[PDB]
């Protein structure tokens, strides 16, 4: 009886619900059940709730003051497409220690909010964000702890299609709040594969 941003099957067809073999204490509230193959299943209702909350939350910031971070390969394209639409700054690839706490570094910047792809892989960013006191928005999978995360978005943050649809929905809802024109499809946010289409 709950309204989803997109039809439930789209979410399921993307694999946002499929977690890993491991589940942390922090993620308990977001895990629906376990599957035969042993993979934990995240709650699509919960994810949909946080996407809506994160969108409204991120729309309140002036673009460049939002900094997305993702070292995970399949997250690059999605992060760049979210930044195109939203206007956020971003750092894909290796995060240079000091980017947020060393004014001397050339890459130094002062975002008001940091949004990482994985609190484990993008931990250097999370650490520095914490040191400065900047809120952290983080996509969290069953295996992630919500250590220094202020806004947890429970989802599979490893899947090519999972990342795509989540970054797409976030960007779409922010654009909708702004009354901003948005015409991208999910495929437009998906990492491109060698041998694939474009």
mmCIF file of C-alpha atoms in Angstrom:
data_model
loop_
_atom_site.group_PDB
_atom_site.id
_atom_site.type_symbol
_atom_site.label_atom_id
_atom_site.label_comp_id
_atom_site.label_asym_id
_atom_site.label_seq_id
_atom_site.Cartn_x
_atom_site.Cartn_y
_atom_site.Cartn_z
ATOM 1 C CA UNK A 1 0.000 0.000 0.000
ATOM 2 C CA UNK A 2 3.174 2.104 -0.271
ATOM 3 C CA UNK A 3 4.008 4.288 -3.282
ATOM 4 C CA UNK A 4 7.416 3.667 -4.841
ATOM 5 C CA UNK A 5 9.352 6.184 -6.953
ATOM 6 C CA UNK A 6 9.352 3.518 -9.658
ATOM 7 C CA UNK A 7 7.514 0.194 -10.020
ATOM 8 C CA UNK A 8 9.021 -2.416 -7.607
ATOM 9 C CA UNK A 9 10.021 -4.757 -10.420
ATOM 10 C CA UNK A 10 12.265 -2.089 -11.951
ATOM 11 C CA UNK A 11 14.114 -1.994 -8.611
ATOM 12 C CA UNK A 12 14.273 -5.794 -8.488
ATOM 13 C CA UNK A 13 15.286 -6.032 -12.145
ATOM 14 C CA UNK A 14 18.248 -3.783 -11.264
ATOM 15 C CA UNK A 15 19.328 -5.824 -8.244
ATOM 16 C CA UNK A 16 19.225 -3.036 -5.684
ATOM 17 C CA UNK A 17 17.962 -5.624 -3.190
ATOM 18 C CA UNK A 18 20.741 -8.191 -3.627
ATOM 19 C CA UNK A 19 23.295 -7.849 -0.850
ATOM 20 C CA UNK A 20 26.313 -10.029 -0.103
ATOM 21 C CA UNK A 21 27.176 -13.117 1.987
ATOM 22 C CA UNK A 22 27.748 -10.844 4.974
ATOM 23 C CA UNK A 23 25.480 -8.688 7.127
ATOM 24 C CA UNK A 24 26.605 -6.144 9.733
ATOM 25 C CA UNK A 25 24.871 -5.036 12.902
ATOM 26 C CA UNK A 26 24.283 -1.582 11.419
ATOM 27 C CA UNK A 27 22.460 -2.973 8.381
ATOM 28 C CA UNK A 28 20.093 -5.234 10.321
ATOM 29 C CA UNK A 29 17.184 -2.766 10.070
ATOM 30 C CA UNK A 30 17.464 -2.828 6.282
ATOM 31 C CA UNK A 31 17.677 -6.567 5.658
ATOM 32 C CA UNK A 32 14.399 -8.225 4.639
ATOM 33 C CA UNK A 33 15.485 -11.895 4.672
ATOM 34 C CA UNK A 34 18.191 -14.194 3.307
ATOM 35 C CA UNK A 35 18.021 -16.128 0.071
ATOM 36 C CA UNK A 36 18.706 -19.760 -0.724
ATOM 37 C CA UNK A 37 22.134 -18.902 -2.157
ATOM 38 C CA UNK A 38 22.922 -17.133 1.114
ATOM 39 C CA UNK A 39 22.767 -13.525 -0.080
ATOM 40 C CA UNK A 40 20.965 -11.069 2.179
ATOM 41 C CA UNK A 41 18.071 -9.124 0.734
ATOM 42 C CA UNK A 42 17.769 -5.393 1.407
ATOM 43 C CA UNK A 43 14.325 -3.796 1.859
ATOM 44 C CA UNK A 44 13.157 -2.017 -1.304
ATOM 45 C CA UNK A 45 10.612 -0.082 0.768
ATOM 46 C CA UNK A 46 13.441 1.199 3.011
ATOM 47 C CA UNK A 47 15.703 2.111 0.080
ATOM 48 C CA UNK A 48 12.882 3.981 -1.646
ATOM 49 C CA UNK A 49 12.301 5.923 1.583
ATOM 50 C CA UNK A 50 15.921 6.998 1.902
ATOM 51 C CA UNK A 51 16.208 7.930 -1.768
ATOM 52 C CA UNK A 52 13.290 10.316 -1.319
ATOM 53 C CA UNK A 53 14.827 11.756 1.844
ATOM 54 C CA UNK A 54 18.315 12.059 0.371
ATOM 55 C CA UNK A 55 16.958 13.784 -2.723
ATOM 56 C CA UNK A 56 15.095 16.430 -0.737
ATOM 57 C CA UNK A 57 18.154 16.750 1.504
ATOM 58 C CA UNK A 58 20.602 17.256 -1.387
ATOM 59 C CA UNK A 59 18.340 19.662 -3.255
ATOM 60 C CA UNK A 60 18.738 22.176 -0.447
ATOM 61 C CA UNK A 61 22.439 22.654 -1.142
ATOM 62 C CA UNK A 62 23.944 24.863 -3.813
ATOM 63 C CA UNK A 63 25.443 22.405 -6.392
ATOM 64 C CA UNK A 64 29.223 22.855 -6.076
ATOM 65 C CA UNK A 65 28.834 22.500 -2.297
ATOM 66 C CA UNK A 66 27.865 18.837 -2.822
ATOM 67 C CA UNK A 67 30.819 16.500 -3.380
ATOM 68 C CA UNK A 68 30.231 12.938 -4.633
ATOM 69 C CA UNK A 69 33.004 10.377 -4.187
ATOM 70 C CA UNK A 70 33.476 6.974 -5.764
ATOM 71 C CA UNK A 71 36.529 4.847 -6.359
ATOM 72 C CA UNK A 72 34.433 1.801 -7.403
ATOM 73 C CA UNK A 73 34.662 1.455 -11.173
ATOM 74 C CA UNK A 74 30.972 0.847 -11.931
ATOM 75 C CA UNK A 75 30.182 4.001 -9.964
ATOM 76 C CA UNK A 76 32.110 6.451 -12.161
ATOM 77 C CA UNK A 77 29.582 6.881 -14.954
ATOM 78 C CA UNK A 78 26.641 7.141 -12.510
ATOM 79 C CA UNK A 79 28.444 9.681 -10.332
ATOM 80 C CA UNK A 80 29.331 11.787 -13.386
ATOM 81 C CA UNK A 81 25.744 11.701 -14.692
ATOM 82 C CA UNK A 82 24.341 12.707 -11.294
ATOM 83 C CA UNK A 83 26.808 15.596 -11.247
ATOM 84 C CA UNK A 84 25.824 16.655 -14.752
ATOM 85 C CA UNK A 85 22.153 16.924 -13.773
ATOM 86 C CA UNK A 86 22.552 18.107 -10.189
ATOM 87 C CA UNK A 87 25.670 20.223 -10.691
ATOM 88 C CA UNK A 88 27.549 18.608 -7.838
ATOM 89 C CA UNK A 89 31.329 18.389 -7.749
ATOM 90 C CA UNK A 90 32.812 14.903 -7.817
ATOM 91 C CA UNK A 91 35.914 12.801 -7.475
ATOM 92 C CA UNK A 92 35.962 9.378 -9.129
ATOM 93 C CA UNK A 93 39.043 7.211 -8.968
ATOM 94 C CA UNK A 94 41.584 7.573 -6.169
ATOM 95 C CA UNK A 95 40.759 10.168 -3.507
ATOM 96 C CA UNK A 96 43.887 12.171 -2.662
ATOM 97 C CA UNK A 97 44.486 12.161 1.084
ATOM 98 C CA UNK A 98 44.121 15.770 2.172
ATOM 99 C CA UNK A 99 41.491 16.765 -0.383
ATOM 100 C CA UNK A 100 39.260 18.066 2.438
ATOM 101 C CA UNK A 101 41.677 18.834 5.279
ATOM 102 C CA UNK A 102 44.790 20.210 3.577
ATOM 103 C CA UNK A 103 44.339 23.733 2.175
ATOM 104 C CA UNK A 104 47.768 23.431 0.516
ATOM 105 C CA UNK A 105 46.907 20.414 -1.622
ATOM 106 C CA UNK A 106 45.907 21.506 -5.125
ATOM 107 C CA UNK A 107 42.761 19.344 -5.051
ATOM 108 C CA UNK A 108 41.565 20.894 -1.784
ATOM 109 C CA UNK A 109 37.889 21.864 -1.776
ATOM 110 C CA UNK A 110 35.245 22.806 0.761
ATOM 111 C CA UNK A 111 31.986 20.932 0.180
ATOM 112 C CA UNK A 112 29.144 21.310 2.695
ATOM 113 C CA UNK A 113 28.107 17.675 2.165
ATOM 114 C CA UNK A 114 29.984 14.578 0.987
ATOM 115 C CA UNK A 115 28.212 11.687 -0.751
ATOM 116 C CA UNK A 116 30.287 8.507 -1.043
ATOM 117 C CA UNK A 117 29.594 5.290 -2.955
ATOM 118 C CA UNK A 118 30.896 2.950 -0.256
ATOM 119 C CA UNK A 119 31.917 3.927 3.309
ATOM 120 C CA UNK A 120 34.543 1.174 3.180
ATOM 121 C CA UNK A 121 36.166 1.806 -0.193
ATOM 122 C CA UNK A 122 35.692 5.564 0.010
ATOM 123 C CA UNK A 123 36.798 5.631 3.680
ATOM 124 C CA UNK A 124 39.485 8.264 3.230
ATOM 125 C CA UNK A 125 36.773 10.692 2.094
ATOM 126 C CA UNK A 126 34.472 9.706 4.955
ATOM 127 C CA UNK A 127 37.312 10.177 7.460
ATOM 128 C CA UNK A 128 38.200 13.656 6.265
ATOM 129 C CA UNK A 129 34.539 14.631 6.038
ATOM 130 C CA UNK A 130 34.230 13.662 9.681
ATOM 131 C CA UNK A 131 37.359 15.536 10.726
ATOM 132 C CA UNK A 132 35.857 18.736 9.294
ATOM 133 C CA UNK A 133 32.354 17.987 10.533
ATOM 134 C CA UNK A 134 30.737 17.686 7.096
ATOM 135 C CA UNK A 135 27.643 15.397 6.851
ATOM 136 C CA UNK A 136 28.164 12.171 4.925
ATOM 137 C CA UNK A 137 25.611 10.608 2.619
ATOM 138 C CA UNK A 138 26.552 7.005 1.856
ATOM 139 C CA UNK A 139 25.223 4.138 -0.240
ATOM 140 C CA UNK A 140 25.485 1.159 2.130
ATOM 141 C CA UNK A 141 25.319 -2.555 1.352
ATOM 142 C CA UNK A 142 24.712 -5.400 3.814
ATOM 143 C CA UNK A 143 28.476 -5.624 4.460
ATOM 144 C CA UNK A 144 28.961 -1.921 5.202
ATOM 145 C CA UNK A 145 28.766 -0.433 8.664
ATOM 146 C CA UNK A 146 27.264 3.040 8.937
ATOM 147 C CA UNK A 147 30.318 4.195 10.868
ATOM 148 C CA UNK A 148 30.643 7.900 10.222
ATOM 149 C CA UNK A 149 27.621 8.047 7.933
ATOM 150 C CA UNK A 150 24.877 10.614 8.602
ATOM 151 C CA UNK A 151 22.428 9.482 5.945
ATOM 152 C CA UNK A 152 22.394 5.794 5.009
ATOM 153 C CA UNK A 153 20.973 4.764 1.639
ATOM 154 C CA UNK A 154 20.531 0.943 1.989
ATOM 155 C CA UNK A 155 21.223 -0.753 -1.329
ATOM 156 C CA UNK A 156 23.496 -2.944 -3.433
ATOM 157 C CA UNK A 157 26.386 -0.595 -4.204
ATOM 158 C CA UNK A 158 28.331 -3.028 -6.355
ATOM 159 C CA UNK A 159 26.002 -3.811 -9.233
ATOM 160 C CA UNK A 160 26.350 -1.945 -12.518
ATOM 161 C CA UNK A 161 22.570 -1.618 -12.886
ATOM 162 C CA UNK A 162 22.029 -1.107 -9.134
ATOM 163 C CA UNK A 163 24.297 1.918 -8.972
ATOM 164 C CA UNK A 164 22.800 3.266 -12.192
ATOM 165 C CA UNK A 165 19.152 3.220 -11.084
ATOM 166 C CA UNK A 166 19.919 4.635 -7.648
ATOM 167 C CA UNK A 167 22.048 7.545 -8.852
ATOM 168 C CA UNK A 168 19.459 8.064 -11.626
ATOM 169 C CA UNK A 169 16.508 8.230 -9.207
ATOM 170 C CA UNK A 170 18.366 10.557 -6.848
ATOM 171 C CA UNK A 171 19.217 12.895 -9.711
ATOM 172 C CA UNK A 172 15.700 12.597 -11.142
ATOM 173 C CA UNK A 173 13.966 13.531 -7.892
ATOM 174 C CA UNK A 174 16.240 16.508 -7.296
ATOM 175 C CA UNK A 175 15.545 17.757 -10.810
ATOM 176 C CA UNK A 176 11.844 17.266 -10.187
ATOM 177 C CA UNK A 177 12.027 19.297 -6.962
ATOM 178 C CA UNK A 178 13.761 22.082 -8.880
ATOM 179 C CA UNK A 179 11.229 21.943 -11.673
ATOM 180 C CA UNK A 180 14.311 21.217 -13.702
ATOM 181 C CA UNK A 181 13.979 19.491 -17.086
ATOM 182 C CA UNK A 182 15.108 15.828 -16.852
ATOM 183 C CA UNK A 183 15.145 13.418 -19.803
ATOM 184 C CA UNK A 184 17.685 10.742 -18.929
ATOM 185 C CA UNK A 185 16.966 7.004 -18.833
ATOM 186 C CA UNK A 186 18.493 4.430 -16.519
ATOM 187 C CA UNK A 187 20.694 3.189 -19.331
ATOM 188 C CA UNK A 188 22.162 6.691 -19.556
ATOM 189 C CA UNK A 189 23.668 6.381 -16.066
ATOM 190 C CA UNK A 190 25.018 2.817 -16.464
ATOM 191 C CA UNK A 191 28.757 2.224 -16.712
ATOM 192 C CA UNK A 192 29.695 1.426 -20.275
ATOM 193 C CA UNK A 193 31.139 -1.989 -21.071
ATOM 194 C CA UNK A 194 33.870 -2.788 -23.561
ATOM 195 C CA UNK A 195 32.030 -4.486 -26.403
ATOM 196 C CA UNK A 196 28.748 -2.923 -25.406
ATOM 197 C CA UNK A 197 26.518 -0.247 -26.899
ATOM 198 C CA UNK A 198 26.688 3.534 -26.527
#
